[PDB]
Amino acid sequence: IDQTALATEIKRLIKAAGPMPVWRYMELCLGHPEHGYYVTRFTTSPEISQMFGELLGLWSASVWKAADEPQTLRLIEIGPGRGTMMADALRALRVLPILYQSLSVHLVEINPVLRQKQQTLLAGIRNIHWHDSFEDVPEGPAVILANEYFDVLPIHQAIKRETGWHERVIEIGASGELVFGVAADPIPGFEALLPPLARLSPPGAVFEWRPDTEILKIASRVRDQGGAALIIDYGHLRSDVGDTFQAIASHSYADPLQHPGRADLTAHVDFDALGRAAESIGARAHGPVTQGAFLKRLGIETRALSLMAKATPQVSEDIAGALQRLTGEGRGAMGSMFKVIGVSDPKIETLVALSDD
Amino acid sequence: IDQTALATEIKRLIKAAGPMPVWRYMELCLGHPEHGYYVTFTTSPEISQMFGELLGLWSASVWKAADEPQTLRLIEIGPGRGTMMADALRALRVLPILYQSLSVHLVEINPVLRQKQQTLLAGIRNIHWHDSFEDVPEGPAVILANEYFDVLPIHQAIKRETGWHERVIEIGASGELVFGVAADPIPGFEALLPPLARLSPPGAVFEWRPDTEILKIASRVRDQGGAALIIDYGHLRSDVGDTFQAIASHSYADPLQHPGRADLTAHVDFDALGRAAESIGARAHGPVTQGAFLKRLGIETRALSLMAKATPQVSEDIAGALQRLTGEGRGAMGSMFKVIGVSDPKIETLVALSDD
């Protein structure tokens, strides 16, 4: 009677090991080797318009100059998807011969079939490599692009009670359906890791966080080898409270506890926490700013106008809508909800469109 | 250097008559004879045939609640392309007795828009067109008004220690249009203002629309029978806040930009709508969210039925349409759009609004 095959597995794991923390449930829903969302089955910015990849390609050129124009620049992308974003970025960079020949592309992709389509699309370009993990990428100054990477990492949640903060968990309800629950005992020194203000939250407040593992790795690399990383995702600028754990459907948001393994899950990225982690180990944070402000400062409006002027009526209309979806607000536009933050080698004092005020 | 011809006209009028009230600026941007917006596919009926079909079936429920009148006027205010009415009629066609009891009446002021509707429904008889709601012959009826109220000029006032001053449009330093405040307060504005809103701090914005249209609609059903269905973007309880915006194809925009070339809107106050109806003897039902309304009418089952028999692409189009109409997030309107019914006081409940 279980809604999905994974649901059956989860319920069994709960009866066997006890309440399952939210982060674990999200991890299983997305990565189960047999029933994960990714293992089994165009809204992203690069799929929406060629302009996204092109502009990040040109932003990468600005970083190259800020890094003293290294003869070898590693252009690393974490989670290339179909490889569309990289194709567009490379096409824009091809216009600058010197830099184009100083590039070495490194796409980190764990999935096989996903790695294959990426290989056929970029089959024509030389100096392109694939890696199972960020760690396998050769050393050297780099430009790291991470679009929607952090938003799909398992989210950890805790709820404020008289006794302190207890981890939020998943349990089995009366009808045998999955439900949200609260851990028996509070997390030891949780308050000691919370931003001062959040400590004064009233009962029932929900605090969300993710371990700093990934950001520390990315921040360590640029600090040690040079360059900068660009992180783009749905999130907020200041650490705060609130539950943002949701399933994402094609034209709306959905209940995260429904159809485990068959739904794409997400949670806001805390850009305040990302910046702090970067600074804690010596790397320099830039921004953060809204996606809309970032792209407009890079000249997306002028590029859009140029493409519209030379396009057929329908394509021109498609470009105009793409511009709004990428930089405006309302009706599902992501210009305000998506944010951008840069993390660089401390030697680099400013990054274009982020801290060049 | 003016963005449009209307912008120029607005400048002149401001220099000649003084600051222009927000409601007057919107009225001009939308209806100027030669420079208005309406004189120059995101609506629910254009998104799916299901919207019109379900309202057609809801209309049948009202017919039964009104004791099955032998003649039921089916009035639509602002039929757009006439798509919604074509879908409603197709669903009603399945019920012969009621279908023959229908007399369709579309209120359309625009000529070319009236023509498109005529071509689309040229095949059905007992269909009539009217310049205004007042031209429609008397008799029991079901009145359907989708997005009619959200495009009526919005009035705005700002709270100051000296009282509430009407919000107006002025000319800035660079000759651009800007928001301003009237010099003197509105006389007895605090009266007839929701008690709570009266305690608003300075800078609070209150929005309202005269009750002319809703009073005409409400007295009609009170006097002749039937009910009206009003669907629009809005809120359930009177409150404060500026919601005056221009509507673009994939986002919202600055209302003071390109006057006459942008579709303008403001939240409909469903609380005020209900109060006006009740103030003259009519009965308000609901209001509820569009999402809850359509789900209660069985939209999920109809959608499933349609996708089971459709090609892969059409099936996908139906699934997305269901979300846009009933869910929330990513631009879905199931939560932001609300629905309210207003009926002959004799009708005590309306399906999906006050039956639960």
UniProtKB/TrEMBL annotation, chain B:
Superkingdom of origin: Bacteria
GO BP field: methylation
EC numbers on record: 2.1.1.-
One Pfam entry name: Methyltransf_28
GO MF annotation: an example: protein-arginine omega-N symmetric methyltransferase activity
Record's keyword terms, sorted: Methyltransferase, Transferase
UniProt keyword annotation of Ribosomal protein present: no
Enzyme class (EC, first level): transferase
InterPro entries: NDUFAF7, NDUFAF7_sf, SAM-dependent_MTases_sf
SUPFAM superfamilies, A to Z: S-adenosyl-L-methionine-dependent methyltransferases
Keyword Transcription regulation among UniProt keywords: no
Gene3D superfamilies named in the record: 3.40.50.12710
Protein name per its UniProtKB record: DUF185
Source organism (scientific name): Rhodopseudomonas palustris (strain ATCC BAA-98 / CGA009)
